[PDB]
Amino acid sequence: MGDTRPRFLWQLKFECHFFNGTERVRLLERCIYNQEESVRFDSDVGEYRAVTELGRPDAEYWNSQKDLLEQRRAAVDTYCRHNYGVGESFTVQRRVEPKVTVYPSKTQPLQHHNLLVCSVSGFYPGSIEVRWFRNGQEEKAGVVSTGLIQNGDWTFQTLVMLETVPRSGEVYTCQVEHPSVTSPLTVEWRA
Amino acid sequence: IKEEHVIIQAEFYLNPDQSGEFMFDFDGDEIFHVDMAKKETVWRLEEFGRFASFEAQGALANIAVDKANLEIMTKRSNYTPITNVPPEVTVLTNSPVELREPNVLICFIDKFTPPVVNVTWLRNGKPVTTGVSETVFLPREDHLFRKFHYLPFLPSTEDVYDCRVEHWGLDEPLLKHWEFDA
Amino acid sequence: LSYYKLGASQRVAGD
């Protein structure tokens, strides 16, 4: 990008970790210089700790401020639990149903090898179960999955492909289970 | 990780570009960020802004403090610069492609730093800027960044597309290609 | 509407 001048980066991250809804909460405040974490505050520790030498002046300076320390100790309640509650309805409780299609990867003739694609797109959250069936028998052996793909727009997609040698009269079925639907989605492809 | 969720308030300042960022992340997805030029809260999806609000002035004041901290830490490290880490680039569609039915190309940019990148969409080698949208730099546990760019398009057998990414860690601009396969 | 609470950025040591 033309500009060869040196760059200097400072990052500040407040991580709120939640377990069992809000039954257990941990706050991790991290300062990162360039690509190295320098100093952190771990709510399980209760005070700032230096990760590298560069961060030692800050930790000690911050640990001498009792107001800052008490505020950070209470931030699991005033900061973490509050923001969880604020966004609960459209984050934790977000449910978007997947769209499932089945199609052959290539128009390769019959009695020859083919990749059948089960496309599962537009869903949230990430947990999902995709299974292939030949004439009602579960196929676990030739299943090639792209894994979970984050689209960046609060939807996921995944491509689960089955290696097959399709013969006439065979029926292939892709079954998808996801929290947004109570009963599975099933799409079939006829050979 | 089944019962666990993570909310991250991630912000940064970069010199000498004088670039700042402030955003909230939930399980890896952006809830909102603050546009510094417009001084405004930008929700990642519109519906979010109908359940929640945010006072953006706090974000701006945070960024000012981050700037002062960035200059102090730079001096304290004997002016140690960051080492460029070049990005990985992937191009996908967001749904199965059907000829002449609207779709979206996704350009996923991952595992890079510093958070400065130049992205261009090319259709048949020509820059395309119509309907495009993009995310800010998203945080990663390894303290690198992610980014998404989007291009709505009408699939056809006649067009090829490239996502061109420039970054100081690359020897040359990187082009990732997409085509319909008949 | 409920508001997100800000994590206040603090000043580092030195000058």
Residue numbers in the entry:
A (entry chain B): 0 to 190
B (entry chain A): 1 to 182
C (entry chain C): 1 to 15
Quote the study that presented this structure, word for word:
CD4+ T cells recognize a broad range of peptide epitopes of severe acute respiratory syndrome coronavirus 2 (SARS-CoV-2), which contribute to immune memory and limit COVID-19 disease. Analyzing six epitopes, some with very low binding affinity, we solve X-ray crystallographic structures of each bound to HLA-DR1. In summary, each peptide bound HLA-DR1 canonically in the “forward” orientation that is described for HLA-DR,48 excluding CLIP. We observed little deviation in the overall structure of HLA-DR1 irrespective of bound peptide, particularly within the peptide binding groove, where the solved diversity of bound peptides had little impact on the position of the HLA-DR1 residues that lined each pocket.
M176–190 has confirmed restriction to DRB1∗0101 in humanized mice, using DRB1∗0101-expressing APCs46 and via HLA-DR1-M176–190 tetramers. In our study, M176–190 had the highest affinity for HLA-DR1 assayed (IC50 = 8 nM). The structure of HLA-DR1-M176–190 was solved at 2.3 Å resolution in space group C 2 2 21 with three copies in the asymmetric unit. HLA-DR1 bound M176–190 via the register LSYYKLGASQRVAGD, which is in line with previous in vitro data determining a minimal epitope for reactive CD4+ T cells. This register placed the archetypal aromatic P1-Tyr into the P1 pocket as well as the favored P6-Ser and P9-Val. P4-Gly represented the only mismatch from mooted motif ideals. Outward TCR-facing residues were most varied at the N terminus (P−1-Try and P2-Lys) and the C terminus (P8-Arg). In contrast, the aliphatic central core (P4-Gly and P5-Ala) maintained a low profile in the groove. Despite being the highest-affinity binder, M176–190 did not distinguish itself by best satisfying EL/BA motifs compared with other epitopes with lower affinity (particularly S511–530). The strongest binding peptide, M176–190, also satisfied 3/4 binding pocket preferences: incorporating its mismatch at position P4 (Gly).
